[PDB]
Design an enzyme around this catalytic site. Structure first.
Site, mmCIF file in Angstrom:
data_model
loop_
_atom_site.group_PDB
_atom_site.id
_atom_site.type_symbol
_atom_site.label_atom_id
_atom_site.label_comp_id
_atom_site.label_asym_id
_atom_site.label_seq_id
_atom_site.Cartn_x
_atom_site.Cartn_y
_atom_site.Cartn_z
ATOM 1 N N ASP A 18 23.887 34.263 43.640
ATOM 2 C CA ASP A 18 23.201 33.079 43.145
ATOM 3 C C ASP A 18 21.742 33.357 42.815
ATOM 4 O O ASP A 18 21.132 34.310 43.308
ATOM 5 C CB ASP A 18 23.243 31.959 44.179
ATOM 6 C CG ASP A 18 24.597 31.284 44.263
ATOM 7 O OD1 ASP A 18 25.564 31.776 43.664
ATOM 8 O OD2 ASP A 18 24.671 30.233 44.920
ATOM 9 N N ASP A 19 21.198 32.475 41.977
ATOM 10 C CA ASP A 19 19.772 32.242 41.725
ATOM 11 C C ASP A 19 19.189 33.257 40.750
ATOM 12 O O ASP A 19 17.980 33.201 40.476
ATOM 13 C CB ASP A 19 18.930 32.249 43.016
ATOM 14 C CG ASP A 19 19.300 31.119 43.993
ATOM 15 O OD1 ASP A 19 20.192 30.284 43.712
ATOM 16 O OD2 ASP A 19 18.692 31.072 45.079
ATOM 17 N N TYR A 112 22.551 24.573 46.867
ATOM 18 C CA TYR A 112 22.667 24.101 48.244
ATOM 19 C C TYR A 112 24.092 23.724 48.614
ATOM 20 O O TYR A 112 24.315 23.196 49.710
ATOM 21 C CB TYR A 112 21.730 22.908 48.500
ATOM 22 C CG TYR A 112 20.366 23.116 47.885
ATOM 23 C CD1 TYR A 112 19.445 23.963 48.478
ATOM 24 C CD2 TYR A 112 20.009 22.490 46.690
ATOM 25 C CE1 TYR A 112 18.205 24.182 47.905
ATOM 26 C CE2 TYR A 112 18.777 22.705 46.120
ATOM 27 C CZ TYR A 112 17.880 23.547 46.731
ATOM 28 O OH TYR A 112 16.645 23.757 46.154
ATOM 29 N N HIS A 167 22.584 36.292 47.339
ATOM 30 C CA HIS A 167 21.512 35.868 46.439
ATOM 31 C C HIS A 167 20.857 37.110 45.842
ATOM 32 O O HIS A 167 20.329 37.953 46.576
ATOM 33 C CB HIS A 167 20.503 34.990 47.188
ATOM 34 C CG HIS A 167 21.116 33.737 47.735
ATOM 35 N ND1 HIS A 167 21.893 33.730 48.876
ATOM 36 C CD2 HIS A 167 21.111 32.461 47.278
ATOM 37 C CE1 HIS A 167 22.319 32.502 49.113
ATOM 38 N NE2 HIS A 167 21.867 31.716 48.154
HETATM 39 C C1 LIG Z 1 13.731 24.537 48.110
HETATM 40 C C2 LIG Z 1 14.472 25.858 48.271
HETATM 41 C C3 LIG Z 1 15.254 26.149 46.995
HETATM 42 C C4 LIG Z 1 13.402 26.941 48.375
HETATM 43 O O1 LIG Z 1 15.318 25.981 49.407
HETATM 44 C C5 LIG Z 1 16.001 24.932 50.082
HETATM 45 O O2 LIG Z 1 15.598 23.815 50.126
HETATM 46 N N1 LIG Z 1 17.246 25.290 50.771
HETATM 47 C C6 LIG Z 1 18.117 24.349 51.478
HETATM 48 C C7 LIG Z 1 19.203 25.114 52.259
HETATM 49 C C8 LIG Z 1 20.477 24.289 52.499
HETATM 50 O O3 LIG Z 1 20.386 23.110 52.485
HETATM 51 N N2 LIG Z 1 21.805 24.865 52.744
HETATM 52 C C9 LIG Z 1 22.165 26.277 52.783
HETATM 53 C C10 LIG Z 1 22.294 26.735 51.332
HETATM 54 C C11 LIG Z 1 23.481 27.200 50.772
HETATM 55 C C12 LIG Z 1 23.487 27.584 49.431
HETATM 56 C C13 LIG Z 1 22.313 27.464 48.685
HETATM 57 C C14 LIG Z 1 22.204 27.892 47.230
HETATM 58 O O4 LIG Z 1 21.786 27.223 46.334
HETATM 59 N N3 LIG Z 1 22.574 29.235 46.997
HETATM 60 O O5 LIG Z 1 22.446 29.688 45.712
HETATM 61 C C15 LIG Z 1 21.145 27.023 49.255
HETATM 62 C C16 LIG Z 1 21.147 26.652 50.573
HETATM 63 ZN ZN LIG Z 2 20.955 28.658 44.892
#
Ligand SMILES: CC(C)(C)OC(=O)NCCC(=O)NCc1ccc(C(=O)NO)cc1
Ligand SMILES: [Zn+2]
Length: 225
Positions: A18-19, A112, A167
């Site tokens: 991801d990302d 997320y 990621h």
């Molecule tokens: C503002 C930023 C962007 C810096 O970070 C956050 O707020 N994270 C919140 C983390 C979360 O809630 N759950 C765990 C999770 C699972 C997958 C992904 C995802 O998108 N993977 O690609 C992100 C988080």
């Molecule tokens: Zn992401």
């Protein structure tokens, strides 16, 4: 729209990222390609770089059998968006892929892991064939973050049909984890497939996208500003 989190093909295993893309992406793809391993990439438009600045990586990825799908333009919390905002967040990534690759994605993974009925309705209306979650997390974005050695050890016990979350904005994922886990997974009998292949959907990359037009040449519209 169907929601998927586990492969169905016996022996399959999906490394997903991801990302991206990001500054280590050419290394990551070289490592995958050297092992004939296929990755699934859920890309952003403007988040850790502008997608148009990664057009060459994206073209290599597209032409080497890797699966490219949307992760939204700005990496939004999609459960907080209106229908119209979500449509725009998806449209912008579609448009970048049309300009760079000539195609639209048919799949996406929500930032997320957050989605609701509005998200699913937007995906249906925009022609998407699936929302892709996962069933094992490498932990490479946990905080505090596990060491590469810890992540590699976790991979030693992820079972067949795993869809693993990684990621590619994490340098150690590209430089330490993936070079170690590709041989672990291949040598124990797993096939490192894209998500659509491992779901028993098509193994033909052309079936993962909708062709819109010929790929464009870079011009002043290739910008995120
Ligand atoms: C503002 C930023 C962007 C810096 O970070 C956050 O707020 N994270 C919140 C983390 C979360 O809630 N759950 C765990 C999770 C699972 C997958 C992904 C995802 O998108 N993977 O690609 C992100 C988080
Ligand atoms: Zn992401």
């Amino acid at each position: 729209v169907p929601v998927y989190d586990t492969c169905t093909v016996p022996g399959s295993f999906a490394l997903t990222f991801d990302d991206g893309p990001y500054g280590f992406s050419t290394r990551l793809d070289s490592t995958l390609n050297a092992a004939n391993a296929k990755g699934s990439f859920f890309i952003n438009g403007q988040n850790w770089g502008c997608i148009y600045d990664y057009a060459d990586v994206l073209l290599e990825r597209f032409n080497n059998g890797h699966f490219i799908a949307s992760h939204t333009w700005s990496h939004v919390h999609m459960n907080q968006g209106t229908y119209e905002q979500l449509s725009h967040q998806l449209e912008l990534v579609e448009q970048a892929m049309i300009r760079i690759l000539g195609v639209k994605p048919l799949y996406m993974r929500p930032p997320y892991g957050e989605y609701n009925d509005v998200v699913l309705q937007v995906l249906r209306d925009r022609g998407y064939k699936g929302l892709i979650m996962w069933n094992q997390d490498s932990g490479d974005t946990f905080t505090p973050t596990p060491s590469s050695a810890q992540i590699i050890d976790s991979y030693r016990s992820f079972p067949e049909k795993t869809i693993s979350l990684n990621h590619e904005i994490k340098d150690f994922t590209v430089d330490q984890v993936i070079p170690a886990v590709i041989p672990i997974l291949q040598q124990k009998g797993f096939s490192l497939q894209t998500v659509p292949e491992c779901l028993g959907l098509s193994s033909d990359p052309a079936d993962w996208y909708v062709r819109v037009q010929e790929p464009g040449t870079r011009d002043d519209s290739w910008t995120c500003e």
